[PDB]
Structure formats: structure tokens, C-alpha cells
Amino acid sequence: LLTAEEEIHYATLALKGDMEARKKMIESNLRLVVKIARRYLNRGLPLLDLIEEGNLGLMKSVEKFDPKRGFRFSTYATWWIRQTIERAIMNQTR
Numbered sequence: 001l002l003t004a005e006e007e008i009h010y011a012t013l014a015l016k017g018d019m020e021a022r023k024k025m026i027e028s029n030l031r032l033v034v035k036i037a038r039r040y041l042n043r044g045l046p047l048l049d050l051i052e053e054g055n056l057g058l059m060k061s062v063e064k065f066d067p068k069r070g071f072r073f074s075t076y077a078t079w080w081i082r083q084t085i086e087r088a089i090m091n092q093t094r
């Protein structure tokens with residue numbers, strides 16, 4: 001778990017392309033993916049698939065997270081994880 005000070009430090013580096021900072025941010029939020037994924041069960045995708053799609057969002061969330069927008073990383077990551085899951089559920093309809 002990252003302090004606010006640590007999170008902003010890593011976020012500033014991550015925004016500039018620092019992969020170690022991006023890794024630190026993702027590793028601190030791996031649990032968030034499973035927790036969110038569980039909320040989308042029984043919608044046509046099994047849990048492992050929901051985790052996989054959620055993971056896509058968590059990874060995307062460290063590519064351009066700007067602390068200056070005023071939101072904490074776990075918030076921005078939550079939005080992204082929900083979005084990639086919801087996208088995957090949409091894709092079940094062709």
C-alpha cells in the first residue's frame with residue numbers, strides 16, 4: 001500500500017514513462033482488480049476472464065495517470081478496470 005506521498009512520486013515518474021514506477025503502482029492495486037471483477041460475475045464471463053480484462057485496464061491506467069487532475073490513483077484505476085470489463089461484456093454482443 002502506497003502513502004499519498006509515495007503514490008504521487010511514482011505517478012509523476014510513471015507519467016514520464018518510468019516502468020519501475022508503473023510496476024510499483026500496478027503491484028499495489030492487483031487486489032483491486034479481483035474485487036471489481038467479482039462485481040461483474042454472472043454476466044457471461046467467468047471470473048478469470050473478468051480478471052484478465054480488468055488487468056488490461058489497470059495496466060492502461062498507469063500510462064497516463066495525472067495526479068494534477070485531482071483524483072487518487074486507486075480511483076482512476078477503478079474507473080479503468082470497470083471500463084475494460086464493461087467493454088468486454090459489450091463485446092459479447094456482435
Ligand code: NA
Nearest residue numbers: 003004005006
Ligand atoms: Na503521505
Ligand code: NA
Nearest residue numbers: 070071072075
Ligand atoms: Na480520488
